[PDB]
């Protein structure tokens, strides 16, 4: 494949005073475009975007029984109110109920987790810092480019997991459905960090538009929760401008 | 396997002077609610709702290679401009590209087609009169209740087909995606026939709302295409009133 830097998208970033990068790749031509080649290769905490490989591994190892698996709430308090209730896989993925996936990771275990991340070529594959924390506040790091490569393998069912489990996770990732296109995506947010070293916000996934497929990965520095919506609005505006969605 | 009449839905029909039926079943098809007990089991030509079993059979027999199958347009005139282009499986289903599925049917062949419709307990299983038009103008008939049972089996991956192939068709059927739910569905429209012998319009599928699932099937007599949008608005209004979608 190839990648080229462009500038026609910069306006979307400057208008919101955002420091970030968008990587958009066209499947048929194996061609990618980005506003920042440097940042496209910089690696950041996956945060909730890790729910994608975590879900696949959970299914492949049997921790997650099947597509109809219901994650029953133990009634015990949770960081969020929307996390306090029974959830399906898609439900757990969207409200991004950390507790549910922390449990999954713990059951998967360090040896197996390490094994699949190697097979998935997932970022720096560093899971040190707590089996249930590495993707949240640990050592794991991944770039936007690596995100799209990973998502393409998932789309093509080429990851080291059953076709069935990859299919299950892909449908759970459906976020927008239109007659002409289907959007599979996942958000991520590590936190606000500081102004010196801000946290990171993500939005990655792919668009099946007509006979074409567009893989995308977006990330930005964030030191204030009020800016969260930008993780989706900026790349959405870009893809709308490209005539892919909207 | 009970069917219970519900009078709180009739208003949606009478308000539009529509003769039809809506069948809704929470959790499973063994207990369903409907506005018309008799019509709920009355069988009608499936029209394009037949694309669901046709797609599954196409995949099972290998006629449809896999999930990424592209159905190429030969450049010859098709009934709708929206059909004159290459299409993916979901693309063909969403725009209801009849010629794509007619070719799938021809390749499947009468022997295999008959075998699978028997396996799926699909309506009266009558495919006579022409392998590429039995669901369009032939003698094949299926009721709203049968549609729900068929869709339920698909949801549970209980049809006589690989889990992989059922998953492929289920994603291609996604028509609405919201944070709290996903709607899998397919429309149908036989034509307008006459006033004395009206055609039929369908909207069948299921809603995955939170940890619950609702299977539904709607059909109505129709002799004027201007009334077609009602196949969706009436059942949508009923499910919105039930607090399922919207
Ligand atoms: Co897809
Ligand atoms: Co589903």
Curated annotation (Swiss-Prot), chains A, B:
Q: How does activity depend on pH?
A: Optimum pH is between 6 and 7.
| Disulfide-bonded cysteines | 25-32
Q: Which residues form the active site?
A: 48
Q: Which residues carry this modification: N6-carboxylysine?
A: 51
Q: Which residues bind a beta-lactam?
A: 96, 187, 189, 231
Annotated effect of mutating residue 51 to A? Abolishes catalytic activity
By its UniProt entry, which Gene3D superfamilies does this protein fall under? Answer: DD-peptidase/beta-lactamase superfamily (3.40.710.10)
Effect recorded for residue 134 to S? Increases resistance to ceftazidime about 30-fold in P.aeruginosa strains PA01 and PA14
In short, the EC number is 3.5.2.6
User: What is the recorded phenotype of mutating residue 7 to M?
Assistant: No effect on catalytic efficiency with respect to penicillins, cephalosporins or carbapenems. No effect on resistance to penicillins, cephalosporins or carbapenems in C600Z1 E.coli strain
UniProt main location, coarse? periplasm
**UniProt subcellular location:** Periplasm
A single Gene Ontology MF term assigned here is: penicillin binding
UniProt xrefs under SUPFAM superfamilies: beta-lactamase/transpeptidase-like
> What does this protein's UniProt record list under function?
Class D beta-lactamase which confers resistance to the beta-lactam antibiotics, including penicillin, carbenicillin and oxacillin, and also some cephalosporins. Confers weak resistance to some carbapenems, in E.coli strain C600Z1. Acts via hydrolysis of the beta-lactam ring. Has penicillin- and cephalosporin-hydrolyzing activities.
What the entry lists under NCBIfam families is as follows:
bla_class_D_main, blaOXA-10_like
Q: Subunit arrangement?
A: Dimer.
Q: What is this protein called?
A: Beta-lactamase OXA-10
Which organism does this record belong to? Pseudomonas aeruginosa
